[PDB]
Ligand binder design. Structure first.
Ligand code: XE
Length: 330
């Protein structure tokens, strides 16, 4: 089997991407944030605290004839951004772009943090990291991909995020018309539960490539590119007027600047992030100070190849017995 679904940016900045997901019988379509940085499928629901729901589409398991409460199961999660959610668990039928999993753990939110409430465009998350990170207690549950893997033509999924435009998530096959050149595969460590790999280095604009190993995770649920302070300072030094701002929370730059590209290495191959992809717009409405899309990971404890980097590539998440990651230009 295979699945193929279009993923769409939630706003003019590509702050995140939503993908339609069919849950239950009859289908309830929710727009979920596919997150290779986490391992819970959770949704706004009829059980969510009414004041914490503001425009989202909710899952109502009582209207699904295939929903079954997972007895005594609970979940609770906290993200790198400081957001959180928690609730109870149903199993139900979940389909993504024509690919169907029966008995999938669907985590129903009783509580969500304010950042989720305030974003009317995301109805929940669909986690695509390893199941070892799933938060369900006292019986850990498998992610959609893990449940589907054995059924897929090939045990892979691909992320093809668009810049200011829709993209595609494919399950079970590699679309060879969707990238240029060849796909370079690189090794993955699953020890922390993520798609963790080691980049071979970087370049700033037209500058020389610096060969240096940079460990990080491929994370579609993170917007920006978070890298060591040395790398990030080298980038922003090429933008006149750019500065790290503690009040803002990161590097800002004049909105009138033209940003240089940023290249990262995958083995001997190179993925180029165009400068425009690194512009995240005014720090506040009407401001001429703009927020940068490459930021320091120094506070975080891990480097993160978020959407800013991933959207410059065709990315293969290979879930073979020994997982690997593939990157191609496109
Ligand atoms: Xe990098």
């Amino acid at each position: 089997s295979t699945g193929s679904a279009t993923t769409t940016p939630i706003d003019s900045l590509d702050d995140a991407y939503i993908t339609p997901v069919q849950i239950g019988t009859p289908a309830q379509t929710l727009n979920l944030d596919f997150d290779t940085g986490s391992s819970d499928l959770w949704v706004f629901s009829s059980e969510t605290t009414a004041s914490e729901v503001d425009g989202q589409t909710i899952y109502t398991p009582s209207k699904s004839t295939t929903a079954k409460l997972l007895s005594g199961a609970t979940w609770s999660i906290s993200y790198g951004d400081g957001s959180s959610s928690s609730g109870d668990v149903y199993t139900d039928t979940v389909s993504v772009g024509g690919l169907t999993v029966t008995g999938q753990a669907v985590e129903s939110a009783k509580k969500v943090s304010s950042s989720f409430t305030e974003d009317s465009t995301i109805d929940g998350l669909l986690g695509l990291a390893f199941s070892t990170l799933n938060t369900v207690s006292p019986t850990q549950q498998k992610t959609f991909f893990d449940n589907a893997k054995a059924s897929l033509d090939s045990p892979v999924f691909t992320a093809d995020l668009g810049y200011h435009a829709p993209g595609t998530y494919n399950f079970g096959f590699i679309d060879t018309t969707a990238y240029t050149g060849s796909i370079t595969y690189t090794a993955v460590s699953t020890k922390q539960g993520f798609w963790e790999w080691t980049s071979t280095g970087y370049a700033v604009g037209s500058g020389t490539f610096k060969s240096t190993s940079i460990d990080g995770i491929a994370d579609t649920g993170t917007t920006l590119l978070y890298l060591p302070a040395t790398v990030v300072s080298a980038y922003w030094a090429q933008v006149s007027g750019a500065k790290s701002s503690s009040s803002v929370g990161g590097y800002v730059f004049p909105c009138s600047a033209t940003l240089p590209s940023f290249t990262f290495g995958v083995g001997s191959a190179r993925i180029v992030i165009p400068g425009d992809y690194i512009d995240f717009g005014p720090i506040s409405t009407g401001s001429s100070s703009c927020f940068g899309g490459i930021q320091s990971s120094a506070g975080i404890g891990i480097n993160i190849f978020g959407d800013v980097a991933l959207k410059a590539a065709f990315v293969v998440f290979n879930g073979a017995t020994t997982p690997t990651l593939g990157f191609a230009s496109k």
